[PDB]
Write a structure and sequence with these properties.
Helix content: 25-40%
GO molecular function: ADP-ribosyl-[dinitrogen reductase] hydrolase activity; helicase activity
Protein name: Helicase-like protein
Order of helices and strands: EEHHEEHEHE
Number of domains: 1
Structural class: alpha/beta
Keywords: ATP-binding, Helicase, Hydrolase, Nucleotide-binding
Strand order of the largest sheet: 1-6-5-2-4-3
GO biological process, one term: purine nucleoside metabolic process
Radius of gyration: 14 Å
Catalytic activity: an N-(ADP-alpha-D-ribosyl)-thymidine in DNA + H2O = a thymidine in DNA + ADP-D-ribose
Amino acid sequence: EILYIKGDATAPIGSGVKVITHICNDIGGWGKGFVLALSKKWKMPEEAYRQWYKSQEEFTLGAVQFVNVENKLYVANMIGQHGIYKDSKGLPPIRYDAVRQCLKEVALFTIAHKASVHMPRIGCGAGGKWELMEQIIKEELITKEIAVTVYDL
């Protein structure tokens, strides 16, 4: 099961390799919420994301970028958000099929690195809803028996 702790995802607990996963948008925006907490500690994730956005090389929904910010520690930039607005049909920016691909890709990364997953309430804000998101995490990570720890407050 998924462990819910009250704390900070940029200061994950436990030992072993760890991967911090969070949802980025496909617009190139970086200045609100969890992203700032990441920039509070490391300049790399923000820089990697921007450079990936400017090159437009496979920068697309469902894709995942990995950044080694510290010893046995990786940040996972997951593009599971479309824009930040709400299209002309009342569709929240969150893309559940994209987060699924993203996590599906995180799954294999964690197994290959014997890592552990640590995230904040990704999706919530955005349009996301934990009821659905929780199921995704379940089917894509807990199912392959990957450790998952959510950080809220």
